[PDB]
A paper describes a structure:
CC chemokine ligands (CCL) comprise 8-14 kDa chemotactic cytokines (chemokines) involved in diverse immune functions. Extensive structural analyses reveal that most chemokines share a common core structure: an N-terminal extension followed by a 310 helical turn, an anti-parallel three-stranded β-sheet, and an α-helix. CC chemokines also readily dimerize, primarily through the formation of an anti-parallel β-sheet at their N-termini. Certain chemokines, e.g. CCL3, CCL4, and CCL5 form polydisperse, high MW reversible polymers in excess of 600 kDa without the assistance of GAG.
Insulin degrading enzyme (IDE) is a M16 zinc-metalloprotease that selectively degrades amyloidogenic peptides such as amyloid β, peptide vital for the progression of Alzheimer’s disease. To understand the molecular basis of CCL4 recognition by IDE, we solved the structure of CCL4 bound human IDE at 3.2Å. In order to avoid cleavage of CCL4, E111Q was introduced to IDE to remove the catalytic base required for the protonation of a catalytic water. The overall fold of the complex shows that, as in previously reported structures of substrate-bound IDE, IDE adopts a closed conformation. We only could model three N terminal residues of CCL4 at the exosite of IDE and 6 residues of CCL4 at the catalytic cleft of IDE. At the exosite, the electron density corresponds to three N-terminal residues of CCL4, which form hydrogen bonds with the E341 carboxyl, and G361 and L359 carbonyl groups of IDE. At the catalytic site, aa 42-47 of CCL4 are clearly visible. We find that Q111 is in close proximity to the scissile bond of a major cleavage site, K45-R46, with the proper geometry for the proteolytic reaction. In comparison with CCL4 NMR structures, our structure of CCL4-bound IDE reveals that, in order to bind the catalytic chamber of IDE, both the N-terminus and the cleavage loop region of CCL4 must undergo a substantial conformational change upon their interaction with IDE. Most noticeably, the α-helical region of residues 42-47 needs to transform into a β-strand to extend a β-sheet into the catalytic cleft of IDE.
Author numbering:
A (entry chain A): 43 to 963, 979 to 1011
B (entry chain D): 1 to 4, 42 to 48
The structure:
Amino acid sequence: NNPAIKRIGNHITKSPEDKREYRGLELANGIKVLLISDPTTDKSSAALDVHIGSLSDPPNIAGLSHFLQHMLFLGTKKYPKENEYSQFLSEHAGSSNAFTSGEHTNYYFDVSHEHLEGALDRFAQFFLSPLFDESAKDREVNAVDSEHEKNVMNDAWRLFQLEKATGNPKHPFSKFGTGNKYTLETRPNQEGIDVRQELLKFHSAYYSSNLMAVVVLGRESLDDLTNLVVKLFSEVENKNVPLPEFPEHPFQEEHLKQLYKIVPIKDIRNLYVTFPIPDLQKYYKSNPGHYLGHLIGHEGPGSLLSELKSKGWVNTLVGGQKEGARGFMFFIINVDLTEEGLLHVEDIILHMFQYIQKLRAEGPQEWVFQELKDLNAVAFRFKDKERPRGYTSKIAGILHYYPLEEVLTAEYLLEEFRPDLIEMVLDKLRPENVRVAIVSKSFEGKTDRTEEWYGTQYKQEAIPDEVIKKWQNADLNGKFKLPTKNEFIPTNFEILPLEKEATPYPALIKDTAMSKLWFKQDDKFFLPKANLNFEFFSPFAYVDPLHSNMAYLYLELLKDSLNEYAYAAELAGLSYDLQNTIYGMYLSVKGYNDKQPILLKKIIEKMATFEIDEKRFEIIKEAYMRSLNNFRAEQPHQHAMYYLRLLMTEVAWTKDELKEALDDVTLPRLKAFIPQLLSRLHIEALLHGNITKQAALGIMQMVEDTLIEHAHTKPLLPSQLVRYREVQLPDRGWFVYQQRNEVHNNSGIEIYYQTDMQSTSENMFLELFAQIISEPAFNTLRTKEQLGYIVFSGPRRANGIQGLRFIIQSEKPPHYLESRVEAFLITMEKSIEDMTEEAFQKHIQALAIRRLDKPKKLSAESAKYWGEIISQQYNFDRDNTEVAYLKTLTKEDIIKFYKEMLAVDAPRRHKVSVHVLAREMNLSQAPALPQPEVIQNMTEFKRGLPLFPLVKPH
Amino acid sequence: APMGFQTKRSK
Ligand SMILES: [Zn+2]
C-alpha cells in the first residue's frame, strides 16, 4: 500500500508494435498520471495539463490565464533565478513550451534522458511556489502584447475572435483570450488592480491538483517513475475546484439565421457555414460527428465538394465537428470561393442542404462506420512512434476526457454504431439554425460595425426568411451519391525480412544518366510503410519567371485533377506531395507500401498525359495571382527572411516578377510547356521503408519507362545538373537592404553573419557557438529587454554555405535592434571567457546529444537521408563524424572563431542586414558600427560580388 | 476534408 496513491493501473492498452511500457495512476490529491518507460529514448520528457483556460479569465482582466502561463517560466521560490528553468534545459539538450486554450493550460518539456529528475524538479515548482516577480511582470507583459500584435493582422485570428463577438456577449466564449498590454497592464492600473496578486489568487484558486494531469517519459523503470512523480507532485494541494461547465450555447436563437459580410486582410474569398450542436465528446466511442464529417467533407466522386468544384463555385472544402467547450460544439462546412462562386452563394448553401437531405434519405450506413473503424484500427496498430515532448503534451491533455486505460486508444478506436446519434446530429443541420459568414474584399466600404479587439470590418444581416424556406424545401439532387467502397485500404502488412546485403545507410543501387537511385530497406521500425522520394531536374523549370509560373500551374492543375482519385488513398493512409522546385519537380509518396505502386503509377502517367480543363486553368490562375499578392500581408520577419534568400542566392525570381510574367501565361502556351519540361530530365530518388532492392529498382524503372513512353523523356546532360551558388561577401564588409511592410505595424530584421563553406570543422564551430548563445539570446533580447515576441538565433545553411542569423520582429526600428544584437554579441564574448571549462564541455555534450538523437519514425529518418542527397553532400554518417570532432574543441578555439569571423573587429566579418520597416515608420550598450553600403538594387548587388564554390560530395 | 487557435509561449 502507498498512501500517496489513490489508485493504480489496471493495464494501459497499447499497440502491439509499441515496445514502450505504460502505467496509469491517480495520486491521492487527484492528479491523473501516466508513466511512460522507454529505455531506448535519448530524450526524456514530462508534461502537465491544467483544466483551466482563458474561459476562466476574469471579465475585468482579459487574458490573465494566458499571462499566468508566461510568468511560471520566470522563476519559483525554490528556483528564484528568472531563467533557471530555460537555462537548465538549454545546457542539457532540452526545450520547453506551453499554450493556453479556452479550457486548458498545457506545459511541457524534453531533456537529456540522464537529467529528467533535475528538469522535472524545476518544472514541478511552477505549480507549487511560483514567484510572479513584479519586475518580471512589467516586462513579460510586452511579450504577450507583441504576441497579440502579430495576430492582429491575421485573417484567421480576426475571424476566430469575430465568431466569439457575434454570440452571447457575456457568454464566457465571448472573452478575449490572448490579452495585450492594455488589458494586462494599462487598464488594471487605472482600475487600481495589483496584477501580481490577481495572478497569485488565480494560481491559488484554479491551479488545484483536482484539475491536473501529468505524463512523464524516461528511461527509468515504471516503479522508478512512480516514486519520482509521487515525490514531487504529492505537494500540489487539492482545493477541490469544481470543473467549469458551459451548458448554455453561446449561439442562441437570436444569433441564428444570421448573415455576416466580412472584410479580410488578404485578398481571399471564403464561405463559413456554422451549425450549433451539443457537446458530442460524451459519445466518443461511437463518434457521430466524425461519421458525418467524413461524408460531408468527402472529396471523392459523388461528393458535395466534387460538384461545387464542377460548377466552378468552390475549390476546397472542410466539414465536420469543431470543438467549442464543455457543453457545446459546432458543426461547420467551410469552402473557398471562386469569383462567380461568390455570386452564387445562396445556391452553394442550397447544394449543401441538398447533400444533407441525401444523407437523411438513405439513412446511417453501417458499412461506412466499419470502414472508418478498420482504418482507425490499422492507423493505431502501425502508428508511427512519437517524439517524447509532443507525446507527453498530448496525453496530458486527453487524460481529462478518458479513463487511464483508454487514453492511448480512445481518440483512435471506434466501438459502437449509434444510428440514433447519427440522425439527431443530422437533425440539427437544418436551415432554421444556420449561421452564414462571407469573407471577401468586395464588402469593403459597405460595412457598418467593427470588431473590438482586432478591428475587423464587417456587416450583420438577418438571412431573409424567403431564403430559409428554399433551403428547408431542398429536393434530392441526383448528382449526390454516397462514396463507394474504399479500395486503397491496405490488406498487406507483411514486413519483408531483412536482406543479406542490407545496408545501414542508403546505398546507390542505380547510377545512369537518367536516374540516380538511393535505397535502404528499413532496419529499425518494421512497419508496412514506405517513403518514395523523387527529385526531377529540368532547366525549363526555373529558367525564367514565366516558366516558374507555368511549372507551378502545371503541378497545381495536375493535383487538382487527381484529387477525387487520391482522396480515397489518403483516407487509407497513402498520401503524396507534389510541388515545383527551383531545380525542377519534387514528388514524395508516403504511407503503407501495399497500394503504393498503384498511386505512383497513376501520378506519373497523369503527369505525362495531362489534358488541361480550361475553366480549371482560369480558376487556379486567378487563385495563384491572389496568392502572390497576398504575400504583401505576411509578417515582417518572414519578409526579412524572404529578401535575404533573394540576396544570397545566385538565381531567384521575386514574387513581383512572377506576377508580371503571369499575365502572359496563356492556355496554349502552358500546354506547350509541359512536353518541353518533360523532354529531358534527371531523376534522383530515395526509396526507403518496407521494400526490397528489387522492388525499389522496379519502382524507379517504372517511373522512367512511363516518362520515356508518354513524354519520350531521354536523359539530361551532367553539366546541366549543377545547383545555385551563394553570394560571397567581402571581408570586413556590411550591407543593408531596406523595405517596408504595408500591412503589419511591426518592424522585422534578419542579421546574417556569413562564415565560410560547410566543412566538418567549420560546421561545428558555428553550431557550438550557436548552442552557447541560444539561451542567452532569448534571455537578453526578449525576457530582459523585451524587443519582441519573436526572437530567433541559430545557424543558416543555404547552397552549401553557412553562417549565423538573428531574426527579430519588434515595434522598435531595425537600426535599434541592430545595436542591441551587436551589444549582445559583446556580452556573450566576455561570458565565454568566464565560463568554467566544465561549463564549456556541458554545452558540447548538450549539442552532441541533440545531433546524436536518432529518429523514431521512418519519415524522420528519411528526412535526414534526403537532406544529404538534395544538399549534394551525401554525408550519411555526418552525426558520428561531426560529433566526434566536436568533443575535440577547446574553449579558446571558439574564442578565436568569434574574434576572427563574428566579432565586431573581425578581419573576415561578413554581415548582411535586412530591414523590414513597420507600416508607419540600465542596459548593455553596443560598439560603434561602420557605415553600411545600402543595397538599392538586388541584381546589381549580386552582379558586383563573387560567388562561393559548391561543396564537394561525400 | 473532415476537421482536425491556441496562444503559445514561443514560436
Ligand atoms: Zn503566449
